[PDB]
Amino acid sequence: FEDESAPITAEDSWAVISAFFREKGLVSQQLDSFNQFVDYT
| One-letter amino acid for residue 37 of the chain | F
Resolution of the entry in angstroms: 2.8
Side-chain-side CA neighbours of residue 8 (13 Å): 7
Please provide the size of the chain in residues: 41
Side-chain-side CA neighbours of residue 17 (13 Å): 6
